[PDB]
Design a protein around this ligand. Structure first.
Ligand SMILES: *[C@@H]1O[C@H](CO)[C@@H](O)[C@H](O)[C@H]1NC(C)=O
Ligand SMILES: *[C@@H]1O[C@H](CO)[C@@H](O)[C@H](O)[C@H]1NC(C)=O
Lengths: 49, 49
C-alpha cells in the first residue's frame, strides 16, 4: 500500500548501477540432409521407385 | 579398442545401428566407418564473366 499525497513528493537521493544480461539465440545449427543415402541405403530398386 | 565379452559380438551406437563387430571364424575386435562421404559442391563465377 504505497502512500499518496497532495502536496508532498518522493525524490531519489542516491542510486545504483545494475548490469542486466540478456541472451538471444542467433544461429540455428545449419543442416543439410541427403535423401538417397537416408532413404535408400545401398540400393537400386529403392532409387528407381 | 572396446571390451568384447566372447559372446558379445555387435557394438551398437547411440543411433542403434551396427558399430563394432567380430569375425565368427577368428576372434578379433573390429571397428566400422561408413562410406559415401558427403555431396557435390560446384563453384562457378558468372557465365558471362
Ligand atoms: C489536498 O488533499 C487533501 C486530502 O484530503 C485535502 O485535505 C487538502 O485540502 C488538499 N489541498 C488543498 C489545497 O485543497
Ligand atoms: C550511495 O550508495 C552507495 C551504495 O549504494 C554508498 O556506498 C554510498 O556511500 C552512497 N553515497 C551517498 C552520498 O549517499
Amino acid at each position: 500500500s504505497v502512500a499518496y499525497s497532495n502536496n508532498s513528493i518522493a525524490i531519489p537521493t542516491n542510486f545504483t548501477i545494475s548490469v542486466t544480461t540478456e541472451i538471444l539465440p542467433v544461429s540455428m545449427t545449419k543442416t543439410s540432409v541427403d535423401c538417397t543415402m537416408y532413404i535408400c541405403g545401398d540400393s537400386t530398386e529403392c532409387s528407381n521407385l | 579398442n572396446k571390451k568384447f565379452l566372447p559372446f558379445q559380438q555387435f557394438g551398437r551406437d547411440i543411433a542403434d545401428t551396427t558399430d563394432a563387430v567380430r569375425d565368427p571364424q577368428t576372434l578379433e575386435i573390429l571397428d566400422i566407418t561408413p562410406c559415401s562421404f558427403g555431396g557435390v559442391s560446384v563453384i562457378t563465377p558468372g557465365t558471362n564473366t
